[PDB]
Amino acid sequence: ARDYTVTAPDGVVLAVQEAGDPEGSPIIFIHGLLGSRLNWSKQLQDPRLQHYRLITYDLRGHGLSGKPAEASSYTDGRRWADDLAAIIESTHARKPVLVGWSLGGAVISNYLAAYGDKGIAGAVYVDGVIELKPDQIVAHPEVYRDMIASDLQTHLDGERAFLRLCFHRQPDATTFSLLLANAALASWDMQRAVRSMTVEAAKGLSKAEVPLLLLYGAQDALVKAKPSIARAKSLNPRIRSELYADSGHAPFLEEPERFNRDLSDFVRMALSR
Numbered sequence: 083a084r085d086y087t088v089t090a091p092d093g094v095v096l097a098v099q100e101a102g103d104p105e106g107s108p109i110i111f112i113h114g115l116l117g118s119r120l121n122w123s124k125q126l127q128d129p130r131l132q133h134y135r136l137i138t139y140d141l142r143g144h145g146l147s148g149k150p151a152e153a154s155s156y157t158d159g160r161r162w163a164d165d166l167a168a169i170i171e172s173t174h175a176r177k178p179v180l181v182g183w184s185l186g187g188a189v190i191s192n193y194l195a196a197y198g199d200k201g202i203a204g205a206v207y208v209d210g211v212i213e214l215k216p217d218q219i220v221a222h223p224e225v226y227r228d229m230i231a232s233d234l235q236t237h238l239d240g241e242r243a244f245l246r247l248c249f250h251r252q253p254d255a256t257t258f259s260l261l262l263a264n265a266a267l268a269s270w271d272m273q274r275a276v277r278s279m280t281v282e283a284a285k286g287l288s289k290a291e292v293p294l295l296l297l298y299g300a301q302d303a304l305v306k307a308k309p310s311i312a313r314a315k316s317l318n319p320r321i322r323s324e325l326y327a328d329s330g331h332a333p334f335l336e337e338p339e340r341f342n343r344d345l346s347d348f349v350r351m352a353l354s355r
Contacts, residue, residue, distance in 0.1 A: 083126075088139070088172040090165045092155065094148035098169060101126045102136035107203075107353055108175040109345070110137045112166065114184030114209075114248075115276065116241060116265035118145030121183065124338035131342055134349065137178070139169055141185070143272025145264070156275035159282065163192035170201060177203035179349050184305060184331065187211045188279065194286030204293040204352035206345060209302050209331045212310040213283050220304055222247065230273050241265050250301040250330030251337075287317040293352045294321045297344060299329030299336065 083101045090096060099119050109131075113121045119138035126136055140147035142165055143156060155161060166189055170178060180202055182190040187210020194205075212218055225247065228240030245258070245265055252258065287294070296314055298307035311323045324344065329336040 088169050090142070090161075090168045092161060092164070094142050094150060094155070094161075094165065096139050096142070096148070096165055096169060097146040098137065098139040098173070100135065100137050100173075102132050102134045104135055106133050106135045107349060108135040108137055108173070108178035109349060110139075110166070110169065110175060110178045110180050112180065112182040112186030112189050113138075113141060113144070114186050116144070116244060116268050117141075117183065117261075118264050118267070120145075120260065120264050121332075122334070124335060125342060125345070128338070128342045131346060134346075135175070137169070137173055137175065141165070141189070143269040143276070145267055149269040149272065151271050153271060153275040153278075156272050157278045157280070159188065159192040159280035160196055162189045162279070163196050166190075166193050167197055177201070177353075179203050179352055180205040181208060181345065182206070182210055183208045183334065184211055185276065188214075188281045188283070191281055191283040191286035194290055195282035199290050199292045202292055204295070204348065205290075206295045206297060206348055207314070208334055208341075209298050209305050209307070210296065210310070211281065211305060212287075212314045213281055214277075214279075218306050218310045218313060220302075220306055222304075230270070230277075237270070238266065241268075247303045248331045249336060250299060250303070250328065253335060283314070284317055287314055287321075290318055293348070293355065294318065295344075295348050296321055296323040297333060297341070298323070298325055299331055299333045300325045300327045301329065302331040304331045
């Protein structure tokens with residue numbers, strides 16, 4: 083495995099990692115809010131995915147990536163799309179498949195809106211944000227308020243509650259503790275701003291020709307699975323979807339064998355269309 087960095091067009095430095103085969107078909111994994119590259123461990127560790135070029139990175143404001151103080155460095159969805167474009171370019175990734183979890187799905191939509199899909203082979207939205215609208219996002223007024231609060235205990239308690247909402251099948255205690263500390267690395271400036279991040283889902287999704295797969299846990303406690311899927315299919319009727327009946331917001335951790343099977347099958351299909 084390799085570690086390196088990529089500078090985005092606004093100067094933010096992204097922490098990037100690679101695993102698998104450097105000459106294999108690339109897959110770029112894009113994590114969600116309060117995550118980091120650590121979310122993807124069960125994908126990166128699977129021998130059955132090792133013949134792909136497995137690329138992860140930390141989103142701006144997360145993990146070991148740069149964390150600008152200005153809210154306007156986060157509220158413009160294009161900045162996050164440009165981060166992704168910079169990684170696609172720097173890695174010289176040849177028609178990668180994009181895999182975006184939750185906020186990562188919104189990053190893909192903004193990338194599709196700005197750049198189109200001629201540079202990629204397909205995309206998987208994993209419990210992806212489609213739009214940030216009440217008809218598509220589960221109500222949690224206490225948690226959403228607390229996790230951006232100025233009071234330190236309230237803020238940390240809010241993040242811990244949010245991380246619990248990321249699962250139906252809770253992870254073991256040690257994995258939860260790793261992801262909890264990982265979440266505490268996220269920028270408070272980013273957290274307050276990302277609420278207001280623009281998402282060009284209608285433009286990015288409706289124009290896509292590459293294959294798109296939406297994989298959601300049916301019991302997702304953060305993103306409303308069926309309404310998000312339905313909104314996406316309304317925008318692009320060629321989207322395929324799958325519901326994992328007994329997963330919540332993080333099926334790649336909750337049902338990793340099934341997820342890795344679906345992901346490898348999707349990539350194989352996208353590359354032989």
